[PDB]
Amino acid sequence: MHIDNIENLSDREFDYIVVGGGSAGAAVAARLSEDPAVSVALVEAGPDDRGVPEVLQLDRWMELLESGYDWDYPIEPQENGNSFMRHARAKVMGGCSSHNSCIAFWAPREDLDEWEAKYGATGWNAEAAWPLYKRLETNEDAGPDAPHHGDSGPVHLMNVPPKDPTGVALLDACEQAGIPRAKFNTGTTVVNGANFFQINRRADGTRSSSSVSYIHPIVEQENFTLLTGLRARQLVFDADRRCTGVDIVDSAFGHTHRLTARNEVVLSTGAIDTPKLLMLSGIGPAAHLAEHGIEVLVDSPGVGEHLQDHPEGVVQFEAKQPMVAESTQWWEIGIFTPTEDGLDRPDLMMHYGSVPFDMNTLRHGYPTTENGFSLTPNVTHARSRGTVRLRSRDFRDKPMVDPRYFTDPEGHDMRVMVAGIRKAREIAAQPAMAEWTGRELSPGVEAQTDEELQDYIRKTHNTAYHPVGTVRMGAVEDEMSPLDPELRVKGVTGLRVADASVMPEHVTVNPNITVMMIGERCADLIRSAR
């Protein structure tokens, strides 16, 4: 059942409680509920997404930013980046899978094999992931000549139709520039190639969000309880340090209500909110906890550390002809390319947008247009690392989010980003684009030297919206990895984390499908443990 008023819930005890009904959390809860002998509650601060067309219609996603569906986290002042940048985070069923552009990627097998081989996460490799991606998807490319793909999973992936003539021309221009058309999600990593994406969207235009895919079909299921509009402020522990539940607050008076879990609690509130919720519960770096008066239950120096992202630049152009009036999600093509020889993974990815993107360029006086297109390069394996810290002991205060963009000591992130701008301009200047590409609006042709392009990036960069890794899994004996390879929070029992915060290293591609895969794996870890 769906419960949007806690006063309507009489039994507040479950076998499992999943906190956060986002990309991973909806997956974990759906999959746990598949055992009819088990009771599952999924707790979500935002509202039910059922019948909210602004959330369900994928082509409207850009309107969700800074709406009532966005927690809206601005960042701390940036030493070498853009202090005006905001981390949009969805506050609704489905989480960010309910606000995103639905770009859908299997992670490179080389990213996933490294989790085990390089970052200590025993059991986390392509072998473990491959069957989970197949289970989770129904993919338009499924068939006997691509047997890795799923044809029955709840998450529908489809090919973006190549209708946009500017995008067709852009791909022709990539080819002229030495970047061929490539198939995505074949299981072989695209190092140098470009194409229209696969998107996780249904035929009727509805996003195939985690809530749509896993949760709408089971809302009436006997052993499953969905609680929306309720915000976890603290996890509850035994004298034995067994997590026994969560304190949640209603939206009416802000009273606190306790829910109890008999087996496990699963925290899935995402890379920004999960570290905050663990810190509020006494799990985190001891000295940081003490600065806010919080009793330390576990000194877990890695909580809130290792924040990773795909920082993103922009090159905008006037179009010489009318741009498309309709689209799947306005950001329909991706281009991968290496800036260096000998890579098994692209170090640079660019999105092509059939709209101007002047969120961070207008305040610096760059001209804009109502008819143009954007190329947005992003650094796939950024080496900068930031933090998420408490702003106070009050759960209602937004956390301090400091990604430290472009601070890696070797200047890697900034180097790749300058090369991405130069590459975006090289592609837009190919013969196949000559009847599309007008004036470069930003950074503009007066910006040519490494210094000018660095100064532009520092001012105008954005994010792909891919924060990860603030509560990472790692070796049982690594003190900086708050989780063991089974996703259990070290130092307490009965508690696991499953969302983007677990990644020990970012993946090369847009991470959503991977985060749902992480949900699917957590459910299996749980089911096998009992």
Point out the residues that are catalytic.
466
If the CB atoms of residues 232 and 433 are measured against ligand FDA, the closer one turns out to be 232
Residue 520 binds ligand FDA (CB under 6 A): no
Residue 273 binds ligand FDA (CB under 6 A): yes
Residue 230 vs residues 5, 246, 261: alpha-carbon distances, Å: 9, 11, 16
Per-residue DSSP letters for 128-167?
A: HHHHHHHHHEEETT-BTTBTTS-BS-SEEEEEPPS--HHH
Between CA 492 and CA 240 the distance in angstroms is 8
Residue 38 vs residues 34, 44, 497, 502: alpha-carbon distances, Å: 8, 20, 19, 25
Piece of 28-36, 215-223, 417-425, 510-518 that binds ligand FDA (CB under 6 A): 510-518
Residue 22 binds ligand FDA (CB under 6 A): yes
Count the Cβ atoms, other than its own, within 10 Å of residue 287: 10
If the CB atoms of residues 88 and 433 are measured against ligand FDA, the closer one turns out to be 88
Residue of the chain from 267, 277, 417, 457 that contacts ligand FDA (CB under 6 A) = 277
Piece of 72-80, 307-315, 410-418, 505-513 that binds ligand FDA (CB under 6 A): 505-513
Residue 335 binds ligand FDA (CB under 6 A): no
Helical axes 450-460 vs 412-428, angle rounded to 10°: 100
Which of 367, 369, 361 is closest to 323 using CA atoms?
A: 369
Which residues, 23 to 62, sit near ligand FDA by CB under 6 A?
A: 23-25, 43-46
Cβ atoms of residues 293 and 279 within 8 Å: no
Between CA 32 and CA 221 the distance in angstroms is 12
Residue of the chain from 358, 510, 522, 523 that contacts ligand FDA (CB under 6 A) = 510
Residue 278 binds ligand FDA (CB under 6 A): no
Amino acid at 465: Y
If the CB atoms of residues 106 and 456 are measured against ligand FDA, the closer one turns out to be 106
Task: Collect all residues with Cβ–Cβ distance below 8 Å to 181 and sequence separation of at least 6.
Answer: 171, 174, 175, 193, 194, 195
The binding site for FAD comprises 23-24, 44, 71, 90-92, 96-103, 232, 465, 500, 510-512
Radius of gyration of the chain (CA): 22
CB 139, min distance to ligand FDA, A: 15
CB 136, min distance to ligand FDA, A: 13
The binding site comprises 23-24, 44, 71, 90-92, 96-103, 232, 465, 500, 510-512
Which of 108, 187, 22, 134 is closest to 507 using CA atoms?
A: 108
Q: Which residue's beta carbon is nearest to the bound ligand FDA?
A: 22
Which of 264, 263, 302 is closest to 285 using CA atoms?
A: 302
Which residues, 426 to 465, sit near ligand FDA by CB under 6 A?
A: 465
Residue 502 binds ligand FDA (CB under 6 A): no
Please work out the total of residues on this chain that contact ligand FDA, with binding judged by CB under 6 A: 39
Residue 500 binds ligand FDA (CB under 6 A): yes
If the CB atoms of residues 214 and 456 are measured against ligand FDA, the closer one turns out to be 214
Between CA 346 and CA 314 the distance in angstroms is 18
Residue 270 binds ligand FDA (CB under 6 A): yes
If the CB atoms of residues 99 and 458 are measured against ligand FDA, the closer one turns out to be 99
Residue of the chain from 155, 328, 511, 517 that contacts ligand FDA (CB under 6 A) = 511
CB 276, min distance to ligand FDA, A: 8
528 SS3 class = helix
251 SS3 class = coil
Which residues, 80 to 109, sit near ligand FDA by CB under 6 A?
A: 88-91, 95-97, 99-103
Residue 474 binds ligand FDA (CB under 6 A): no
Residue 275 binds ligand FDA (CB under 6 A): no
If the CB atoms of residues 351 and 415 are measured against ligand FDA, the closer one turns out to be 351
If the CB atoms of residues 268 and 407 are measured against ligand FDA, the closer one turns out to be 268
Residue of the chain from 21, 167, 229, 311 that contacts ligand FDA (CB under 6 A) = 21
**Backbone CA torsion sign across 380, 382, 385, 386:** negative
CB 325, min distance to ligand FDA, A: 21
CB 91, min distance to ligand FDA, A: 4
Amino acid at 34: E
Residue of the chain from 6, 17, 19, 418 that contacts ligand FDA (CB under 6 A) = 19
Residue 274 vs residues 137, 155, 160, 389, 528: alpha-carbon distances, Å: 26, 24, 33, 11, 24
CB 288, min distance to ligand FDA, A: 19
| Token pair recorded at residue 98 | 């309910």
Residue 504 binds ligand FDA (CB under 6 A): no
Cβ atoms of residues 290 and 299 within 8 Å: no
Residue of the chain from 33, 78, 138, 268 that contacts ligand FDA (CB under 6 A) = 268
CB 70, min distance to ligand FDA, A: 8
186-212: burial string, b at 16+ Cβ within 10 Å, e else: eeebbbebbbbbbbbbbeeebbbbbbb
Residue 227 binds ligand FDA (CB under 6 A): no
Which of the 8 DSSP states describes residue 399?
A: P
If the CB atoms of residues 126 and 453 are measured against ligand FDA, the closer one turns out to be 126
14 SS3 class = strand
- The binding site for ligand FDA (CB under 6 A) comprises 19-25, 43-46, 88-91, 95-97, 99-103, 231-232, 268-271, 273, 277, 465-466, 499-500, 510-512, 515
